[PDB]
Design a protein around this ligand. Structure first.
Ligand SMILES: CCCCCCCCCCCCCCCCCC(=O)OC[C@H](COP(=O)([O-])OCC(O)COP(=O)([O-])OC[C@@H](COC(=O)CCCCCCCCCCCCCCCCC)OC(=O)CCCCCCCCCCCCCCCCC)OC(=O)CCCCCCCCCCCCCCCCC
Ligand SMILES: CCCCCCCCCCCCCCCCCC(=O)OC[C@H](COP(=O)([O-])OCC(O)COP(=O)([O-])OC[C@@H](COC(=O)CCCCCCCCCCCCCCCCC)OC(=O)CCCCCCCCCCCCCCCCC)OC(=O)CCCCCCCCCCCCCCCCC
Ligand SMILES: CCCCCCCCCCCCCCCCC[C@@H](O)O[C@H](CO[C@H](O)CCCCCCCCCCCCCCC)COP(=O)(O)OCC[N+](C)(C)C
Ligand SMILES: CCCCCCCCCCCCCCCCC[C@@H](O)O[C@H](CO[C@H](O)CCCCCCCCCCCCCCC)COP(=O)(O)OCC[N+](C)(C)C
Ligand SMILES: CCCCCCCC/C=C/CCCCCCCC(=O)OC[C@H](COP(=O)(O)OCCN)OC(=O)CCCCCCC/C=C/CCCCCCCC
Ligand SMILES: CCCCCCCCCCCC(=O)SCCNC(=O)CCNC(=O)[C@H](O)C(C)(C)COP(=O)(O)O
Lengths: 70, 459, 107, 178, 56, 88
């Protein structure tokens, strides 16, 4: 049936534009950060606890486990 | 600590030497950059503190407040950008200058190794707020509101200066570190009772206490949106920070002394939450909700247990963000309607759906829905009060229920139902307002992932 | 009564101005479209892109200056030692009584 | 709902309204059709007995006394039509009723779709602008001095005239917009 | 165009200059609190073969 | 829903159907514009019973103020069409 009637509703263009802009910026910064974190975890991360050698004193950033924390 | 202070000072020449149509852009960008700089302070230790120098130190009670104070300025600028459009460049620059000075005073207040410096900055924050309220205010009662706000504060704080100078004359130092390590018991004496009152009432008036809360509805209703934001988000927390800092010297006198205040706050939270039910104004309703939350914070500080302090810190941060968001929403409604009364503009969910979603999220986070930090502070304070006395819960219970009621009431009166037929100037919500709400709400839901970051030094 | 019924010479109250009428895609920032768009971009980039993302990542990966894993390892080693010795875990007294000099009552 | 109200209700209006309420509540009491028909005819017959009564005081005595009886047996949970002010779907679709002026705020990219609709809307806006200017004068001249006495509006009397205050009656959203 | 956008965009440089100046001032103020360096009971340490101060 | 889009023809047909099953009126004498008070000699109570039948037929009830001033099938059809937003 060709009884298609017009639906009066407020303009959703601005809400969609704001949502798209927010998603675009958040992803624009988060996707590189997520990729970098994954590469760091897979390739470099997860140092394992050891014993301090005699006569050697560690530096301040050598007492942490995660590479990004160090 | 100067790595934060100096950029804030440089914000002033940058604003005053800015091009006539680039002040807002320059101010927002550099404020956000300064906020990013402030994030470094969050990495606290389980040891004493972050003592930068003889003048300024950092603490995990001071660090969240500093971060919130820095984060608030871009939001205030974005909120103020709207209604200052028909205004000359000089007066807009003066407004931005006042906001920058307020931030600088708050930043120096929160570090403040010495109590007299803390008092000086604590009262220096008063002038920019008074000028903002009494200058860029719409109604004719802004003068009376400014007078109330000034004189309540000064009547509360004038005995505090005398008490502080007396304490330094006797003890010999007003430094926080020295005071904590050399704290000695206060004998239950009339002079000690009055010293306790002078030390406590100044911070009690700014919370504010239920007896002394009158200035706040006037100041919140009559101030512009930036003024309301800074009053609800940061300026109310100064009293709580001051109490947590100064209470150490007060013991063991606090137990006997605390009863009048504990009763006033436990009954005043109920009174103000009930007042919220019958209100014809959005701003007054938000102000009374703030009064109820700060009464609960007063109870937490007066109980003076570790869980009390963690709950008070979390509740202060959460309330600051939530109340700033609520005032922003009310101002967005007002800028379209110009009435600032709930019952006039109705059914706004049909016309503005995303703004209705923002309203729902703000009302839910004001309602203390878990696992938001609002309920984290709520529950920590409630548990501490229950350990203090098993009867307090009953009052707390009522409070929670009443809170939910008026929150959803504010959600139902303005968003649900049928839109008023006559109003036709309700234009679609701008990107600026939606960004403002998003920047208000995202930090709360990010912080609920890491609650320890806002739980204070007793974590 | 020849009074003009006008208290003073006053400008009429101006009507509110819409940013959408003279400029669609008005972003609610400024009446100038270029400043408008650039203000929107800088707010979005320096708020959502820089602060909310990089700052959250920085706070998430903060080093253990609170010493939580340090405390856990200390407690683990301490309990490992105490169980073996047969010592009764944690002592009631926080300080050793031999180095505390009580005042004698003689009442 | 459409017609203007009167300054009062006459005796016959009151008796008709009481008849309507009583018959509806009896239908609510009598679920089945035959029982309802029998009792409704019995009630109609009882009602018609006092029809030719001429005493006004007696007329006042009648119906008001019946109203007390109606109130006693008023079926505390009567049947209500779904869309009636007490129905289960009274205001289901009020949330879908969007005003027409909202279309004036649409983005041009949205107005690119549905161009014929907006052209017809522009014709409607032109017609409204002319007709309202005519209607102001027409209502000013036709209204009685000292202010209107009854909230009923007069029709149009000329050729090109339109009914006064017509824009917001013609442009109702719909009963079921979505 | 250089020497033209500078006259309009010169203001941006001020906040970062303030930040670096504040960092320098913080280090300089730190330099005046070295009376107990490598003297705390918790961290008495013997200097490395090519070390002069434990922290700067 | 799955409700057919009823039209003016259907409304008028159902109105005249209900009126013809009203045995107080002989079917061959009534018409679309036939009055109730004078053209058919019906009581006001008969008119409100007609309103009852209409309300029970169309599934919605007419307010008393509008109902008490409806005297023709044609104007009843027009009113119900206005209520239901009927196109043709
Ligand atoms: C609105 C939005 C606002 C956003 C605001 C900004 C973000 C704020 C928060 C950012 C914080 C990020 C953070 O802190 O990360 C935490 C954390 C960081 O990890 P870490 O501590 O560095 O690593 C720990 C170890 O040291 C290291 O462990 P490992 O090295 O052994 O692990 C391997 C490695 C890599 O591991 C792998 O790659 C593989 C793992 C699965 C393998 C499965 C098998 C695959 C192989 C088989 C198939 C192929 C081979 C066979 C083929 C044949 C098959 C037939 O792990 C990872 O790389 C994890 C990557 C995490 C990415 C985090 C991204 C954060 C982005 C922040 C910004 C976001 C902005 C929004 C946009 C975001 C983008 C959308 O990452 C996670 O949280 C991961 C969560 C995993 C959850 C698992 C499911 C749990 C379900 C529980 C709930 C149950 C009820 C429901
Ligand atoms: C649940 C798991 C989720 C996993 C996936 C990730 C989801 C991330 C969502 C983040 C939140 C959204 C951002 C906040 C504002 C809204 C943003 C927006 O503009 O949306 C427009 C967008 C498109 O809108 P549109 O169609 O253009 O506009 C239509 C109209 O505006 C009409 O709009 P509308 O009526 O469609 O409104 C949107 C919708 C949703 O929108 C909202 O209301 C957002 C705020 C909801 C929470 C309110 C605060 C309550 C405190 C919760 C704190 C949780 C923090 C967790 C960490 C969060 C990190 C950011 O309304 C609701 O659904 C109300 C939800 C009420 C939830 C009550 C229960 C809360 C506690 C649940 C447990 C959470 C932890 C579980 C832990 C144990 C198990 C792991 O709609 C959405 O994105 C909806 C999002 C889906 C609903 C999420 C509701 C649960 C979120 C809880 C927080 C995340 C939990 C993560 C762990 C889960 C396991
Ligand atoms: C208006 C909105 C709220 C504003 C803030 C209100 C909170 C401030 C109120 C102060 C709380 C009480 C002040 C003093 C409390 C002392 C304890 C006392 O009440 O108990 C008895 C005290 O007895 C009597 O109370 C004596 C004092 C009576 C005179 C006080 C006036 C009472 C009502 C005045 C209220 C007005 C307050 C506001 C003024 C503007 C105990 O007997 P005693 O063992 O012997 O004294 C113990 C104390 N010693 C050891 C130092 C000696
Ligand atoms: C739109 C619809 C949804 C689309 C998206 C779908 C994807 C959903 C995923 C988003 C949330 C779902 C839950 C998943 C959680 C995983 C990430 C989580 O595990 O990381 C958290 C990390 O989050 C941070 O801790 C909290 C965020 C920091 C908040 C600071 C605020 C940002 C500054 C802005 C200004 C501040 C304003 C307020 C002043 C106080 C907790 O980390 P933690 O378990 O601990 O340890 C991490 C590993 N370590 C041990 C190596 C360290
Ligand atoms: C509403 C706030 C609560 C008010 C409760 C009481 C209100 C009634 C008091 C009105 C003002 C009274 C002024 C005189 C008070 C005298 C108190 C006093 O002198 O004690 C000083 C005491 C000991 O004196 P010395 O002689 O040096 O000791 C040697 C021998 N032991 O030393 C001190 O502690 C000095 C501290 C200053 C005391 C503060 C005086 C003002 C009253 C306290 C504040 C309470 C009112 C706050 C106003 C609230 C408005 C927001
Ligand atoms: C289930 C719940 C119980 C409810 C209880 C109800 C009680 C019913 C008994 C009430 C008794 C009466 O009749 S009440 C007595 C009221 N007085 C009169 O009726 C005098 C003149 N009658 C009129 O004027 C009418 O309009 C009329 C001529 C009928 C038609 O008028 P039309 O020609 O303009 O249609």
């Amino acid at each position: 049936h060709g009884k298609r009637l017009f639906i009066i509703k407020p303009s959703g263009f601005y809400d969609r534009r704001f949502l798209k802009l927010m998603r675009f910026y958040i992803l624009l910064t988060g996707i590189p950060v997520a990729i970098g974190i994954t590469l760091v975890n897979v390739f470099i991360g997860e140092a394992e606890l050891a014993d301090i050698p005699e006569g050697y004193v560690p530096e301040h950033w050598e007492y942490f486990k995660h590479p990004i924390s160090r | 600590m100067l790595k934060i202070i100096i950029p804030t000072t440089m914000l002033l020449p940058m604003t005053w030497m800015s091009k006539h149509n680039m002040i807002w852009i320059n101010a927002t960008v550099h404020s956000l950059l300064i906020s990013l700089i402030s994030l470094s302070l969050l990495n606290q230790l389980g040891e004493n503190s972050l003592n930068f120098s003889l003048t300024f130190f950092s603490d995990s009670l001071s660090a969240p407040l500093l971060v919130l104070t820095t984060w608030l300025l871009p939001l205030m600028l974005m909120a103020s950008q709207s209604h200052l459009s028909k205004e000359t460049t000089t007066r807009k620059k003066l407004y931005i200058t006042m906001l920058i000075l307020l931030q600088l005073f708050l930043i120096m207040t929160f570090t403040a190794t010495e109590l007299i410096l803390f008092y000086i900055l604590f009262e220096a924050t008063l002038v920019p707020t008074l000028i903002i309220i009494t200058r860029w205010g719409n109604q004719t009662e802004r003068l009376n509101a400014g007078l109330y706000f000034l004189f309540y504060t000064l009547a509360g704080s004038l005995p505090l200066l005398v008490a502080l100078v007396y304490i330094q004359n006797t003890t010999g130092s007003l430094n926080f570190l020295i005071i904590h390590y050399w704290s000695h018991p206060l004998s239950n004496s009339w002079s000690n009772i009055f010293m306790w009152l002078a030390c406590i009432m100044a911070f009690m008036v700014k919370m504010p206490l239920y007896g002394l809360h009158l200035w706040l509805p006037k100041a919140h209703v009559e101030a512009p949106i930036a003024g309301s934001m800074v009053l609800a988000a940061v300026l109310l927390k100064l009293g709580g920070y001051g109490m947590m800092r100064i209470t150490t010297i007060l013991n063991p006198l606090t137990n006997y002394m605390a009863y009048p205040f504990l009763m006033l706050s436990m009954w005043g939270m109920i009174m103000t939450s009930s007042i919220c039910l019958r209100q014809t104004d959005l701003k007054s309703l938000i102000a009374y909700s703030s009064v109820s939350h700060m009464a609960l914070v007063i109870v937490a500080i007066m109980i003076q247990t570790p869980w009390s302090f963690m709950g008070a810190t979390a509740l202060m941060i959460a309330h600051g963000l939530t109340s700033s968001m609520l005032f922003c929403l009310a101002n967005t409604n007002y800028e379209r309607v110009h009435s600032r009364t709930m019952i006039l503009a109705r059914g706004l969910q049909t016309l503005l759906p995303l703004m209705a979603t923002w309203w729902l999220v703000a009302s839910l986070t004001n309602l203390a829905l878990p696992p938001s930090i609002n309920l984290i502070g709520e529950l920590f304070i409630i548990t501490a009060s229950f350990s203090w006395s098993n009867i307090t819960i009953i009052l707390m219970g009522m409070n929670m229920m009443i809170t939910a009621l008026y929150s959803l009431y504010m959600l139902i009166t303005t968003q649900r139902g049928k839109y008023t037929h006559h109003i036709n100037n309700i234009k679609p919500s701008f990107t600026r307002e939606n960004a403002l709400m998003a920047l208000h709400i995202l930090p709360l839901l990010l912080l609920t992932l890491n609650p320890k970051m806002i739980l204070g030094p007793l974590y | 009564p020849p009074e003009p019924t006008i208290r003073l010479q006053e400008d009429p109250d101006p009507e509110d101005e819409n940013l959408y009428e003279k400029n669609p895609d008005s972003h609610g920032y400024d009446k100038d479209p270029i400043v408008d768009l650039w203000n929107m971009r800088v707010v979005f980039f320096f708020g959502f892109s820089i602060v909310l993302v990089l700052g959250s990542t920085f706070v998430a990966y903060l080093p253990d200056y609170r010493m939580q894993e340090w405390a856990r390892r200390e407690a683990e080693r301490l309990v490992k030692y105490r169980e073996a010795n047969g010592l009764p875990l944690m002592e009631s007294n926080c300080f050793d009584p031999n180095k505390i000099q009580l005042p004698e009552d003689e009442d | 709902a459409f017609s203007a109200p009167a300054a009062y209700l006459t005796h016959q209006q009151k008796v008709l309204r009481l008849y309507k309420r009583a018959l509806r509540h009896l239908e609510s009491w009598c679920v089945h059709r035959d029982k309802y028909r029998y009792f409704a005819c019995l009630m109609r017959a009882r009602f018609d007995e006092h029809k030719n009564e001429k005493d006004m005081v007696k007329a006042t005595q009648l119906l008001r006394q019946a109203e007390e009886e109606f109130w006693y047996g008023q079926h505390p949970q009567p049947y209500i039509f779904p869309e009636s002010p007490g129905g289960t779907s009274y205001e289901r679709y009020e949330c879908y009723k969007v005003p027409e002026w909202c279309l004036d705020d649409w983005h041009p990219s949205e107005k690119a779709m549905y161009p014929d609709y907006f052209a017809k809307r522009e014709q409607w806006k032109r017609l409204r602008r002319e007709s309202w200017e005519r209607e102001v004068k027409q209502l000013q001249e036709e209204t009685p001095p000292g202010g209107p006495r009854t909230e009923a509006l007069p029709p149009a009397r000329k050729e090109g005239d339109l009914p006064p205050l017509w824009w917001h009656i013609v442009t109702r959203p719909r009963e079921r917009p979505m | 165009n250089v020497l033209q956008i500078v006259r309009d965009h010169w203001v941006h440089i001020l906040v970062p200059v303030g930040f670096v100046f504040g960092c320098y001032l913080d280090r300089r103020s730190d330099e005046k609190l070295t009376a107990f360096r490598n003297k705390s009971l918790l961290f008495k340490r013997e200097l490395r073969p090519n070390e002069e101060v434990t922290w700067k | 829903s799955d409700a057919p889009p009823l039209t003016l023809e259907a409304i008028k047909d159902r109105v005249l159907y209900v009126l013809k099953l009203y045995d107080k009126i002989d079917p061959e004498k009534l018409s679309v514009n036939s009055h109730f008070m004078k053209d058919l000699g019906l009581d006001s109570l008969d008119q409100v019973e007609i309103i009852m039948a209409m309300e029970d037929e169309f599934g919605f009830e007419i307010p008393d103020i509008d109902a008490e001033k409806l005297m023709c099938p044609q104007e009843i059809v027009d009113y119900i069409a206005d209520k239901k937003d009927v196109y043709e």
